Design a protein around this ligand. Structure first.
Ligand SMILES: CCCCCCCCCCC(=O)OC[C@H](COP(=O)(O)OC[C@H](O)COP(=O)(O)OC[C@@H](COC(=O)CC)OC(=O)CCC)OC(=O)CCCCCCCC
Ligand SMILES: CCCCCCCCCCC(=O)OC[C@H](COP(=O)(O)OC[C@H](O)COP(=O)(O)OC[C@@H](COC(=O)CC)OC(=O)CCC)OC(=O)CCCCCCCC
Ligand SMILES: CCCCCCCCCCCCCCCCCC(=O)OC[C@H](COP(=O)(O)OCCN)OC(=O)CCCCCCCCCCCCC
Ligand code: HEM
Ligand code: HEM
Ligand code: HEM
Ligand code: HEM
Ligand code: HEM
Ligand SMILES: CCCCCCCCCCCCCCC(=O)O[C@H](COC(=O)CCCCCCCCCCCC)COP(=O)(O)O
Ligand SMILES: CCCCCCCCCCCCCCCCCC(=O)O[C@H](COC(=O)CCCCCC)COP(=O)(O)OCCN
Ligand SMILES: CCCCCCCCCCCCCCCCCC(=O)O[C@H](COC(=O)CCCCCC)COP(=O)(O)OCCN
Ligand SMILES: CCCCCCCCCCCCCC(=O)O[C@H](COC(=O)CCCCCCCCCCC)COP(=O)(O)O
Ligand SMILES: C/C=C(C)/C=C/C=C/[C@H](OC)[C@@H](C)[C@@H](OC)[C@@H](C)CCc1oc2c(O)c(OC)cc(OC)c2c(=O)c1C
Ligand SMILES: C/C=C(C)/C=C/C=C/[C@H](OC)[C@@H](C)[C@@H](OC)[C@@H](C)CCc1oc2c(O)c(OC)cc(OC)c2c(=O)c1C
Ligand SMILES: OC[C@H]1O[C@@](CO)(O[C@H]2O[C@H](CO)[C@@H](O)[C@H](O)[C@H]2O)[C@@H](O)[C@@H]1O
Lengths: 385, 93, 248, 57, 126, 62, 385
């Protein structure tokens, strides 16, 4: 047999990216995964090269990033790529998750693939949080304070956990140094989870836009999808370059260009854009503990989808009501993000609470009710007696 | 190698689909086709035709949300203006 | 949030560095340095800017060497361990007016004038906000506004009450090149200098961006064509079905 | 990209790696000079070179 | 997830009711036409997710002639989909042709599986 | 329908002569893509490599 | 089938650690591989926890390690475990490599396995070098200086490569900060290489002390070898603990408790013990370029063994001459280490040169000659005519 098949190492490359049988009809939404792999590579490489010039000590952190921006040759490119890359990582991940939602990718036999994906989502959010803390600007200090404090809600031992995470009385030197060490580590854990994600994907292959079997007409990954993925790789790079070179701080917060100050929380404080919808969900609950619980539940609720989707067919392509409500969910998520960027004022509080209810209702009420109605509609719309 | 669990997808030669018979496919080499000039007129009419079938599924939900947002935003702007101070005191507490 | 609390929105001025293909106006940066030195430097530090970075941007090597030498910096102690001073050099960073935060606040009625090395990137509005602030002090605050003793009214500052008073007044500086030193001209020049202080890579970044965007645009278009060619056999594939004759 | 023009240089063969790499080296030089000249000319009068010249007095 | 035995139970109830039948069926007909699967040459039964034991049992029992026909519709649908077109109007599946050819095989398999589960868990009342 | 009766492809088939038109265009596209990608990769590797060279603040000779 | 075999993730675990068919006769020497896996884990975990309290800035490095020794709770345990653990990692690796040499583990069909092993050896040496530099004691600075200068021997571009590695005019702040970033990275590359090592091993399985096929009598890894590996895991931990708690600085150099001084190289400078043999080989060549080439060649020569071993049987168990010379090679390697610990003086110089010749002669002359002779002895010692 060919060397690419007989060799112990190349056989893996061949099974995953050369001879892998792909459904002939997968569309451009199936290109987001390769984009996520690219993002992870971009982040790890730019991150390692910046780490060579970074100092984690709380008194040196902010200045070391400025040193990267000013003194390191092409340092500003590394930093803007890493910072804008993180935003892009989340935008593509949101699209990857949305595609899965729309096409019923979370359904059996891909429940394991979906669950590993949820874990990766959590690790990625955590990694981005740790990195943001490393800049040690005003948003870094306060984001570090608030997020670590989320654990103080744990009854009985909460305050002890927070003091442990801090390594002191408050977010200080011990905190930033451990956050950087951890920021370096998690991306490697994510890489290992991505391998687990790919292993789960490989045993069943990808789904397709029709939601039916792809076993009757497959085409090899090599050439077809290798070159189709290249199209989006260049589009992604083009757009990222536009931000990196022409509008590098648009996706960020000006307050992070101000060194962290333990005595002053700026009135203009706002979380990173990709965290806004979750921030809005937390803010919607006028209780400390329930707010924290509800926010984490917003992520964990993704795990109930294989069970609440009662439909007999996979995906939304041929479902009128499901398609409509999917877009209701999408814009509701964007609204949640917009509410998060607003002050806690009338009528934003009520809007946020309603949008929060809608977010959860989608998974727990809308999907099961609508999918059941649609099963019956498909039945009585043709059968007769 | 050890025995592994069966799935719903195999590999070339045993993909796991039903036996096929009676279907005949035909194809022509990319090298023998017109240098991708059949784009416009053959894809410009189809484009937007596909989105004409889908736009309402996207646009209506978008419209509902954009108007809900604008309404709340305008109400907020009023509540914090001099003219809205009366109502602000009422709805705030 | 009330209008006062938010601060008046800063309008969009036509900065010559606005736009993807535009570099900074280096004559404006040079003039802006003079405004910083003669006016701002009395209360504002520029800690993250090294003397050597001004070379080839707004001044000659000789000019910066002469400017740096006008200041004193701590040198290594002598052979007896006694402290000693030395003139500044290109490798040094522009010195601030105060030895510490306590001194800074004592000289400004309790307020701390922020370092300006990154002020343009550290404020919403960037150049527009900085410029509007410097040229936005009215002679008197709007009626009904009680200004806290020691404060100054400026609509562009959130809350309207700012510890910095108007510092720019017509002809307070004598421009080396002959440019009339009006309040708005000085504000425009110093803001441009401060934008360079915050983004010294600006000019090269935009040049590299042009190269990068052109290459990636071509690559993206090229990949679409290559993809279409590689997929042409599949895209035009034809299938025909002839129901098999019943028997097995 | 005319068929006849391509054939005079490559005779129905695709461009080989060695030539691709060699061509990339030449492109890098010419492209950089071209972009730099266009960029500096577009900003004529704003650059330090232009300002340093202006300071003749 | 929802069994076909359950879908049929609810559906038959609507169909056998003159009131509900007049109120629901027209809505269902529009739902199906808007679905658009027939425009890709597919019948509804071709749409059922098959990666489960019930469906595999049903598909294995499907007579050869119909199995070959289903294979063609699925393949043609994938080809049409990848070209981002619909089939010509004359190739669309007609309402009269959108028959539940697989449903009886599915219901039979479900009934057998339900009974096996019941027998596997039977309680003895001495 | 006879399997010997091939369906109509005229819509996509090259009518005019020169059976190498599609080839020349295709190879020019692939070639140009390989060229710009090679220059892009080189620029990228050099960008990273140069970030490890002496920083502006250490190049000060006393 | 059993879940451990059916599940996508568990199947790998079952395949490598539970049902893996092991030759019934492998002895305790086959336990070194599991010990190497344990070592890697120990290093990575202790390293990460220490990283949380470390500062890479050249002015803060040495003091931060002292901070770990003095202020961090159980910090001295983490540091001594990491430092001594590194020494044990090399001792076990030398034994693992020696085991392979003795039993002909490098022979077909395990050449790929052996070659991947050589790569891991090189990466482990590099990693340990980078880590030692991080302490920033006198041995750290000078070791960094000498090792980076090894590349100055490359003609034409050598000096440029060295300046690039330094990030300046000498080993300074940029050098230490990049070395720490790289010290964090390489262990993960080693982990990836170990996975590749295990993959090559898995397709042919382990060899055995008889050097013949193990296919006629296998026993499952689980229980038998899982519990046998536990015996040496505990012995390893016991011995390591004796050093960590009772003699923590015996394997180190006192000079590394003196902060790095760019102006003074101590007369008492000596490389870490595991590097001494290669150090002696370099010192044996009175020429800069050839000394460097020869030292690197001492590692690369390991790759010729599958080709120079002309024997028709795998391993030394039944070979009188081969066993004798294997031990000549082993003690010669120890002698090289002892010579490396001595000053450049008579008669150590000649001894080092002779031992260096013996090291290379083993692979290039002794093995091929002795193996050919043994092949013939086995033939004429029984056959009539
Ligand atoms: C945003 C910041 C992150 C940056 C990452 C960017 C990565 C791209 C993400 C966009 C995406 O995934 O869109 C997929 C959507 C599905 O498309 P389909 O599979 O049904 O296509 C059939 C196609 O004609 C085949 O056509 P063909 O392969 O021949 O060329 C297709 C097209 C592909 O363009 C792309 O690269 C994607 C936009 O090339 C062109 O003709 C463009 C000419 C300049 O493409 C579409 O048709 C667009 C529909 C609207 C989606 C809007 C995106 C929401 C933000
Ligand atoms: C500092 C870093 C290292 C620290 C961790 C290292 C731990 C393991 C390294 C030693 C090693 O691998 O030696 C293997 C060698 C081969 O042995 P074999 O397979 O032919 O055994 C048959 C056995 O009786 C089966 O016997 P059994 O399984 O029933 O018990 C064996 C013995 C095992 O002890 C061990 O822990 C392994 C050494 O348990 C005892 O009864 C001992 C009572 C205290 O065992 C020997 O005979 C030792 C030869 C000495 C050479 C050592 C050279 C090192 C420089
Ligand atoms: C880059 C190149 C790297 C090369 C590194 C060279 C290794 C350096 C030294 C490593 C220390 C341990 C040496 C390992 C040697 C043992 C290898 C081995 O596998 O030995 C097997 C052998 C007997 O096994 P048998 O199967 O033949 O016994 C007959 C059963 N019927 O077992 C025996 O004969 C008994 C083993 C006695 C070991 C004596 C070791 C002396 C080492 C001194 C330690 C260093 C002190 C500073
Ligand atoms: C670092 C992040 C991730 C990487 C690198 C990654 C990569 C991939 C790749 C290469 C594919 C196949 C191609 C595709 O469909 O796009 C895939 C499929 C899939 N991924 Fe991910 N993924 C990531 C995160 C996630 C997340 C966060 C989820 C869900 C919460 C997820 C859910 C899925 C599912 C269900 C599929 C199957 C899609 C289908 O075939 O219908 N992935 N992923
Ligand atoms: C999963 C991949 C990663 C994500 C999602 C991520 C995300 C981030 C984010 C959001 C920031 C803040 C950027 C800013 O606002 O300036 C950051 C900073 C940083 N990251 Fe990462 N990162 C990743 C991997 C890495 C890796 C592997 C390293 C290795 C040490 C690294 C090193 C750094 C450093 C030194 C900074 C500070 C400089 C800067 O602010 O850009 N990152 N990262
Ligand atoms: C044209 C030269 C100057 C420039 C460009 C300048 C610019 C600025 C800017 C941008 C701020 C930040 C306001 C904010 O937080 O948004 C500020 C604050 C301040 N400046 Fe200046 N300044 C100049 C001269 C001066 C002088 C000469 C003094 C001392 C007599 C002074 C005292 C202060 C103080 C006390 C603050 C703090 C205001 C507050 O937070 O309430 N400034 N200045
Ligand atoms: C972090 C480093 C390493 C790890 C974790 C590792 C691990 C392993 C393990 C678990 C085994 C199976 C059990 C055994 O024979 O000990 C093995 C076998 C082997 N390893 Fe390694 N190894 C490492 C480094 C090396 C090196 C440096 C070489 C050689 C230059 C090497 C050569 C071999 C060979 C040839 C075998 C097969 C032995 C036989 O079955 O006869 N390994 N290794
Ligand atoms: C194969 C893995 C590793 C090896 C062989 C190794 C080896 C070493 C060595 C020999 C030292 C010097 C110890 C001394 O004499 O004090 C060192 C120091 C250090 N290593 Fe590692 N290391 C490994 C992995 C790691 C990892 C993954 C990290 C994570 C950042 C790490 C962090 C450190 C730190 C902070 C020090 C300085 C404190 C000290 O001197 O112990 N190491 N390492
Ligand atoms: C990465 C590290 C490499 C190290 C490799 C060493 C392999 C040894 C791992 C031991 C697992 C034993 C599982 C036995 C089992 O599941 O059998 C269970 C029984 O387990 C027990 O009785 C508990 C034994 C306690 C062993 C202590 C673990 C030591 C932890 C230190 C090891 C650090 C690496 C099934 O037993 P049964 O067969 O009689 O029904
Ligand atoms: C987190 C990552 C974990 C790693 C997962 C493994 C993924 C594998 C991806 C690696 C792609 C690279 C494969 C190139 C090597 C293939 C050639 C080969 O194996 O030739 C090998 C020899 O290889 C060597 O000596 C060294 C290989 C080192 C590779 C280091 C990158 C020939 O092997 P052969 O198949 O011909 O069989 C030998 C006859 N008994
Ligand atoms: C280099 C990276 C590491 C290499 C990856 C391979 C090695 C994996 C070793 C990890 C051991 C951990 C295995 C525990 C998972 C086994 C249970 C399982 O897969 O249940 C899964 C569901 O798992 C999940 O939802 C999340 C799994 C996340 C695991 C996170 C560590 C059930 O899958 P199941 O096999 O039952 O599929 C049904 C077939 N009719
Ligand atoms: C490790 C992956 C990092 C890739 C980041 C992709 C995001 C797009 C912008 C990247 C710009 C960085 C370089 C730069 O500024 O160069 C600019 C040119 O950039 C290009 O041509 C980019 C095209 C991308 C091609 C990349 C192929 C893949 C790289 C694999 C490397 C083995 C400027 O070049 P210069 O300094 O003038 O020589
Ligand atoms: C050692 C490692 C640790 C402790 C890791 C912890 C990770 C925790 C979670 O990740 C899994 C967490 C980041 C994730 O919660 C699900 C996010 C959605 C939290 C979003 C979040 O962001 C904020 C933020 O960014 C801010 O910036 C200035 C300010 C903030 O308030 C003013 C918030 C905030 O109120 C919330 C809820
Ligand atoms: C960024 C990463 C880089 C540059 C990695 C480089 C890796 C290089 C090699 O590893 C692969 C190298 C460590 C390896 O050479 C084969 C060793 C055997 C080197 C042995 C070695 O040690 C010394 C040492 O430790 C000292 O300490 C105080 C002092 C030394 O002279 C006095 C030496 C010395 O003269 C030699 C040859
Ligand atoms: O602290 C400044 C001090 O100046 C006064 C003098 O009346 O304020 C006047 O001048 C300021 C300088 O621009 C204005 O900002 C201010 O609005 C104006 O009344 C004092 O009121 C003030 O404390």
């Amino acid at each position: 047999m060919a060397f690419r098949k007989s060799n112990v190492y190349l056989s893996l490359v061949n099974s995953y990216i050369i001879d892998s049988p792909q459904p002939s009809s997968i569309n451009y939404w199936w290109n987001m995964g390769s984009l996520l792999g690219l993002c992870l590579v971009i982040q790890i490489v730019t991150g390692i090269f910046m780490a060579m010039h970074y100092s984690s000590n709380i008194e040196l952190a902010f200045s070391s990033v400025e040193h990267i921006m000013r003194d390191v040759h092409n340092g500003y490119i590394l930093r803007y790529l890493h910072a804008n890359g993180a935003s892009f990582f989340f935008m593509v991940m949101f699209m990857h998750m949305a595609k899965g939602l729309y096409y019923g990718s979370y359904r059996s036999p891909r429940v394991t693939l979906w669950n590993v994906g949820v874990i990766i989502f959590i690790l990625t959010i955590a990694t981005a949080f740790l990195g943001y803390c490393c800049v040690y600007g005003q948003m870094s200090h306060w984001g570090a304070t608030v997020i670590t404090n989320l654990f103080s809600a744990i009854p009985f031992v909460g305050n002890d956990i927070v003091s442990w995470l801090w390594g002191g009385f408050s977010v200080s030197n011990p905190t930033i140094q451990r956050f950087f060490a951890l920021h370096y580590l998690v991306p490697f854990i994510i890489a290992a989870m991505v391998i687990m994600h790919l292993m789960a994907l490989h045993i069943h292959g990808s789904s397709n836009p029709l939601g039916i079997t792809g076993n009757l007409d497959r085409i090899p990954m090599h050439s077809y999808f290798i070159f189709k993925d290249l199209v989006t790789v260049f589009l992604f790079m083009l757009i990222l370059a536009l931000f990196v070179f022409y509008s590098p701080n648009t996706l960020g917060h000006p307050d992070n260009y101000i060194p962290g100050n333990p005595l002053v929380t700026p009135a203009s404080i706002v979380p990173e854009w990709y965290l806004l919808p979750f921030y809005a969900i937390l803010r919607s609950i006028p209780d400390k503990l329930l707010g924290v619980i509800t926010m984490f539940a917003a992520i964990l609720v993704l795990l109930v989808l294989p069970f609440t989707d009662r439909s007999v067919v996979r995906g939304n392509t041929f479902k009128v009501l499901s398609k409509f409500f999917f877009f209701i969910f999408v814009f509701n998520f964007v609204l949640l993000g917009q509410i998060g960027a607003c002050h806690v004022e009338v009528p934003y509080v009520l809007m946020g609470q309603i949008a929060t209810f809608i977010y959860f209702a989608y998974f727990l009420i809308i999907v099961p009710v609508i999918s059941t109605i649609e099963n019956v509609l498909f039945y009585i719309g043709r059968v007769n007696k | 190698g050890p025995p592994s669990g069966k799935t719903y997808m195999g590999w070339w030669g045993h993909m796991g689909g039903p036996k096929q018979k009676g279907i005949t496919s035909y194809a022509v080499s990319p090298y023998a086709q017109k240098p991708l000039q059949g784009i416009f007129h053959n894809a410009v009419f189809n484009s937007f035709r596909r989105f004409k079938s889908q736009f309402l599924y996207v646009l209506i939900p978008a419209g509902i949300y954009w108007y809900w947002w604008k309404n709340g935003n305008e109400y907020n702007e009023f509540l914090y203006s001099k003219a809205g101070r009366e109502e602000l005191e009422r709805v705030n507490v | 949030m009330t209008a006062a609390e938010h601060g008046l929105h800063a309008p969009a001025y036509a900065w010559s560095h606005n736009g993807p293909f535009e570099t900074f106006d280096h004559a404006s940066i040079r003039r802006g340095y003079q405004v910083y030195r003669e006016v701002c430097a009395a209360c504002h530090s520029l800690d993250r800017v090294a003397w050597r970075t001004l070379v080839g941007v707004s001044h000659t090597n000789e000019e910066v060497r002469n400017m740096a030498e006008e200041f004193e910096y701590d040198d290594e102690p002598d052979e007896q361990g006694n402290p000693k001073k030395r003139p500044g050099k290109l490798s040094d960073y522009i010195p601030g007016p105060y030895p510490n935060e306590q001194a800074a606040r004592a000289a400004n009625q309790g307020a701390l004038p922020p370092d300006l090395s990154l002020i343009v990137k550290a404020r919403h509005g960037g150049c527009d906000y900085i410029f509007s602030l410097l040229t936005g002090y009215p002679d008197e605050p709007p009626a009904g506004v009680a200004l806290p003793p020691g404060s100054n009214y400026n609509p562009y500052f959130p809350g309207g009450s700012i510890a910095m008073a108007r510092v720019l007044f017509d002809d307070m500086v004598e421009y080396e090149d002959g440019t009339p030193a009006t309040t708005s001209q000085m504000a425009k020049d110093v803001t441009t200098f401060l934008n360079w202080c915050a983004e010294p890579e600006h000019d090269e970044r935009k040049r590299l961006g042009l190269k990068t965007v052109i290459i990636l645009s071509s690559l993206y278009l090229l990949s679409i064509w290559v993809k279409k060619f590689k997929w042409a056999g599949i895209k035009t594939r034809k299938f025909v079905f002839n129901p098999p004759k019943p028997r097995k | 990209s005319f068929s006849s023009l391509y054939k005079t240089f490559f005779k129905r063969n695709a461009v080989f790696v060695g030539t691709i790499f060699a061509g990339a080296f030449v492109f890098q030089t010419v492209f950089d000079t071209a972009i730099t000249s266009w960029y500096e000319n577009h900003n004529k009068g704003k650059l330090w070179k232009d300002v340093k010249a202006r300071i003749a007095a | 997830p929802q069994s076909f035995t359950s879908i049929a139970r609810i559906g038959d109830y609507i169909l056998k009711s003159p009131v509900l039948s007049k109120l629901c069926v027209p809505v269902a007909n529009q739902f199906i036409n808007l679905a658009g699967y027939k425009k890709l040459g597919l019948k509804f039964d071709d749409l059922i997710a098959e990666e489960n034991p019930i469906m595999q049992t049903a598909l294995r029992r499907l007579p050869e002639d119909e199995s070959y026909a289903r294979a063609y519709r699925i393949i043609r649908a994938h080809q049409t989909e990848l070209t981002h077109h619909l089939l010509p109007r004359n190739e669309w599946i007609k309402a009269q042709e959108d028959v539940p050819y697989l449903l009886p095989y599915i219901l039979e398999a479900e009934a057998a599986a339900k009974e096996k589960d019941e027998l596997d868990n039977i309680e003895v009342s001495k | 329908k006879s399997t010997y009766r091939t369906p109509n492809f005229d819509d996509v088939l090259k009518e005019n002569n020169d059976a190498d038109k599609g080839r020349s265009y295709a190879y020019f596209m692939v070639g140009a893509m390989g060229l710009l990608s090679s220059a892009g990769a080189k620029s990228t590797v050099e960008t990273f490599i140069s970030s490890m060279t002496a920083t502006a603040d250490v190049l000060a000779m006393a």
